[PDB]
């Protein structure tokens, strides 16, 4: 024979919007939710016995209901509520994992004035989270951002690297740096101001990336920029225990025009989709 | 036997970023361009004669070159320069059409302070344009916006429609209205303040959709909203001669939970991707 | 001040699958349909009067309904039925347009035996159609194929073209030719064997592109290959009156490796997404 | 303060096509590659020291060069060569992980003869792999298939499930089953006939999904179909050690037409993108 390494089932792509009407003032949150369950029994896989299966339509129905019953403050707490539900409202469930994405609605805003009930879509950075809980254990939550495409046109360089027989790249004291940042962090407590924690992380990444809006900040290696950002998050948000960052390097190359008799000294650039540099890192607090 | 009704060829997906730097204060524009040429001879089609063909690679080189030589003030004027170039540098080109999309870079901004050289991607709406010119004739420019996703949670209704065998819909005094607006307008002259124009059209659409940030504005049929915005655009911008608008109705339905013994008082909603209402309209000035 | 040039509304992305079970042998057709209606009255746009509006939900319901009632033999005939219905079941509808996309289900098959009820998704090319009819007029049908990606590794060249100030490209005796074909043709009668005609066009396109299967056939100009195919379709199918073809030129370049001291003698190629050649043409029968 | 958990960097989306010409017979492989390296030194993150950095542009060139130098027989073998190189041509590299996706070119074929140099795109299923190697250690290869959309119109059901407060679903003896299979397996030796292994796994999955092309095989639970496929994969291919399979449930629901006074007798269906059932599992050989 064989041996199970891992099982799970659930409903994916459960889209939902929750509204809270105050005055004429509406609060809105829309997300796409994915829930996975692990069972104590594997008779479902072994012999096709369905008697312990919560039907995927039902888990769909449950997410909708919990939205009504518990309400939705943040994507994280909702995830935690879904988790706790499947672990306490049932007995044969050993593990539940919720991954949800938030739909980036932004309240319409004419300088300081905010519309009571109109919103526009602004994918600046995309918010997501995950909450995973084992039966009778304290839950684990990750939060993160993705697709934050930022661009700086100077105060970046790359020099003094290893040259080998396959190397053709020449040194550069100045070059574009364009990325689409992805970040994912684990919390040390279930007790966090999630909305606020999130904002802080985001603001940190953009900040160490851009530096002072005046003179900028020179960055000599995206590795070092990446590490410096990690450390800054860990100081500002004590409840973050671990942080992972992915920074693609989406290239803009100066178009050489000598073969057509023009001298293009860094006016016109060719944005190149593929391929792309990729720079990663995951750091945690010394236990 | 047969007859040509229409020919064209060129290069598509020509990406470019043009930068203009004042020391540490940098200005940028990035776009994706498509250009098409029509030739006087069809010997290329009839007999495979390449004697009159301007290679697509040359069209690419040219878009690159003109970006350096002419600079890029707007995606529209860039579009007009490409049209003019191929009609005057050659004798046998009868028509040229350039369709271009702007990559929506936004200068980074915190609390009134704006970064000298850093950008974020937050597409309220995506900008695009077209310029089409025949030999020795005056060129025609269209400009437009797309993928502007907006949501209204109230101040919309839909009642008093026709019932037939297939109608199941009941009257509604109040409901969500969500759309992803697309608009395209033909200018009556090449003499336009393009940046201010495009923004003016956008702001008009958002303002008429949302209404006052105080109370909103009721709309009984999206057709009328569509029509009203058209008229409003024709008042606000004299150089616009014709305007087309497509408004999807991307649906948000109140989830019935009675089958699970809960009463959902318009709190939790189901976003439904497909299908979607589609309401279009095209209006021009009466000569 | 103003004047309508064009109006229309409807429901889009209406997905539907129809099944016809004879023995244990199931026949299936799945499509995504979008229908647009034009009304005699414009009081809906002008004054928010909905009394002539056939609700888009009803348009949705009707497409589901006609499917049961008329059944679905082809997307073209279904499109024609939708047309006929809205024109004959109402009097205030002046125009209806149905554009349909077909989901490329292919019956599962191992060694000549065909599963009675299992299917796999292998979109060699994607099929679509359009039907447009004016009140009490004879309808017009278009059919076409899209996203048919094919590649040749030889028997193509591009020499004897124009050099101008911006040309850098040299003669090429041999090169890859890769495209993603789009074709769209109008029938001169509603009386067509649609499944057979469509297949005929497709086979013509690939055959004139690729064959004979041994040594292939040299083509000196993509313009000419496109054209010869237009003539071959017009010879094989008397009911096609007009045909349009678009062929992107998706580039594969031999990677120059001399700068790293290797000689790449046309072994390793760079597939490049952007930019792309584009070659178009529309010819019709000499009336 | 802190301590590293995981570092890595490289080039992503490296596209490559390798051609091998015999007679008139051309062989082709087109793939897209991702390479990640881990270094012994962390001076790069700590202080922005680049003296140990192999530039991503170099990794791109290395990949290109290796395609020419070593050739490309399978995407797995190419992956292993890239691993091998960076670990042996250098000293400071502690780990390399390469991920490759294959572009599904299929040789064009009519009436028993196969074209010598023409291909068409039929992603029946999409192939991919991963090779990860630590310095001086034995490398690990995973391979997989994805986006295999298969559909059956009968021989599936779902009954005898667990009921709770949020359940509305009723027993169902017969229903459509549409999935888009994803499977990924680890080999216990890097010494494998990859092309055949791949193919066997693929055919096994479509095999067990459809049952006999005559009567099908009744299936009561995708968990069992899932598990059943996993064991047949492990018995037919001794070199796969662990197997992961994910199967979405892309729903096709019978359209109730009674509210418009029709009986839709399991003829017409609504395909639903969202939400989707999801059933996963990972089983391995017991050590």
Author numbering:
A (entry chain A), B (entry chain C), C (entry chain D), D (entry chain B): 8 to 294
Share the article's original sentences.
Urate oxidase (uricase, Uox) catalyses hydroxylation of urate to give 5-hydroxyisourate (HIU). This is the first and rate-limiting step of uricolysis, a three-step enzymatic pathway present in both prokaryotes and eukaryotes that converts urate into the more soluble (S)-allantoin. The oldest known structure of the enzyme is a tetramer of the tunnelling (T) fold domain able to catalyse urate oxidation without the help of cofactors. The zebrafish (Danio rerio) urate oxidase (chr11: 8151055.8158017) encodes a protein of 298 aa with a C-terminal tripetide (ARM) corresponding to the type 1 peroxisome-targeting signal.
The crystal structure of DrUox was obtained at 2.8 Å resolution with a continuous electron density from Gly8 to Pro294. The DrUox structure shows the typical T-fold with a homotetramer organized as a dimer of dimers joining head-to-head to form the functional tetramer. Each monomer contains two tandem repeats of the T-fold domain forming an antiparallel β8-sheet with four main α-helices located at the concave side of the sheet. Two monomers assemble into a dimer by a two-fold axis to form a β16α8 barrel. The main dimerization interface is an antiparallel β-sheet formed by the N-terminal (aa 8–20) and C-terminal (aa 282–293) β strands of two subunits. The active sites (four in the tetramer) are located at the dimerization interfaces. In the crystal structure, chains A-C and B-D at the tetramer interface are connected by a disulfide bond involving Cys129, a residue not conserved in Uox sequences. The geometrical parameters of the disulfide, classify it as having a Left-Handed Staple conformation (+LHStaple), a rare bond characterized by a high strain energy. Phenylalanine 216, a residue strictly conserved in Uox alignment, is not part of the tetramer interface, but establishes main chain and side chain interaction with lysine 158 of the tetramer interface. F216 is not directly involved in substrate binding, but is involved in a cluster of hydrophobic interactions with active site residues.
